[PDB]
Design goal:
ephrin receptor binding; protein kinase binding; about 280 residues; alpha/beta; hydrolase; 7 helices; globular; about 20% strand; binds (azepan-1-yl)(2,6-difluorophenyl)methanone
Length: about 280
């Protein structure tokens, strides 16, 4: 059912809360036993947000392979994403180990380091060219190469060096800096333009490892980004674009990470971005 028509029908009937609870009720429940081991307590930001065992990313080390991160593999769309929490003071070295091992080209950050007067994630990248960062626990060096600051987002070029082999790679950091402290953006224009800049970079393409996407918990804003990208890609691949069912795509993605889309307002915003995004691509 043309999702724009369903959209107006839910708005007029004021039933976003009911639609959102139905998704919550139908969503997959898989074990997360590795996340709950006592040795991993200081590797989780939130007690109620854990990666499933079946889809978790493993660190390549025999000591402790755990990170709060999930592989979202979208079979029909032919896109994969790694969704993860904002790094903690004791997991910044793990974070960059994962980027290195998974062969990612891009990191997408949808939060500010401080929001609502509290820290939402560690300062995990260097702010000045001449002050690089060394992660002694994982043997990596990270240097800021360039920074481009725009009204709604910042793009950074970073150099990651594996100190063990002296290999280097260029990583692109896409930082959406204007998501409001409360609620969702009033217009999906800045977010869709941001999505379009990540795509244009190559960061989402199959010649690279999966893009790493985070916010504070890695389920809410992070969920909105992947859901919008996958829905738009399906609407361009299929003969009948009106067959793309956002609710069904979200439940497929919830097979791989719990809690994607955290509020009925985030669900409404996800609809708005896809609907308004399709008509801009199709030529209009
Ligand atoms: O002007 C818009 C737009 C729209 F299509 C619908 C509603 C409000 C808007 F602001 N966009 C410009 C860049 C393309 C991706 C974002 C959309």
């Amino acid at each position: 059912m043309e999702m724009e028509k369903e959209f107006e029908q839910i708005d007029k009937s004021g039933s976003w809360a009911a639609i959102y609870q139905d998704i919550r009720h139908e969503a997959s429940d898989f074990p997360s036993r590795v996340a709950k081991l006592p040795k991993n307590k200081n590797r989780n930001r939130y007690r109620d947000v854990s990666p499933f065992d079946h889809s978790r990313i493993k660190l390549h080390q025999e000591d402790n392979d755990y990170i709060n991160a999930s592989l979202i593999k979208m079979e029909e769309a032919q896109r994969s994403y790694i969704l993860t929490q904002g790094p903690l003071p004791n997991t910044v070295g793990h974070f960059w180990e994962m980027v290195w091992e998974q062969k990612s080209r891009g990191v997408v950050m949808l939060n500010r380091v401080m929001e609502k007067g509290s820290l939402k994630c560690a300062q995990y990248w260097p702010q000045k060219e001449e002050k690089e960062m060394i992660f002694e626990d994982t043997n990596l060096k990270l240097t800021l190469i360039s920074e481009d600051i725009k009204s709604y987002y910042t793009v950074r070029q970073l150099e990651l060096e594996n100190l063990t082999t002296q290999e280097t790679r260029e990583i692109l950091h896409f930082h959406y800096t204007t998501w409001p402290d409360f609620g969702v953006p009033e217009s999906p224009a800045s977010f869709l333009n941001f999505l379009f800049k990540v795509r244009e970079s190559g960061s989402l393409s199959p010649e690279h490892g999966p893009v790493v996407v985070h916010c504070s918990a890695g389920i809410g804003r992070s969920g909105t980004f992947c859901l919008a990208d996958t829905c738009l890609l399906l609407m361009d691949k299929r003969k009948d674009p009106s067959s793309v069912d956002i609710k069904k795509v979200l439940l497929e993605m919830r097979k791989f990470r719990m809690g994607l889309i955290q509020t009925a307002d985030q669900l409404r915003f996800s609809y708005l971005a896809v609907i308004e995004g399709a008509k801009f691509i199709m030529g209009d």
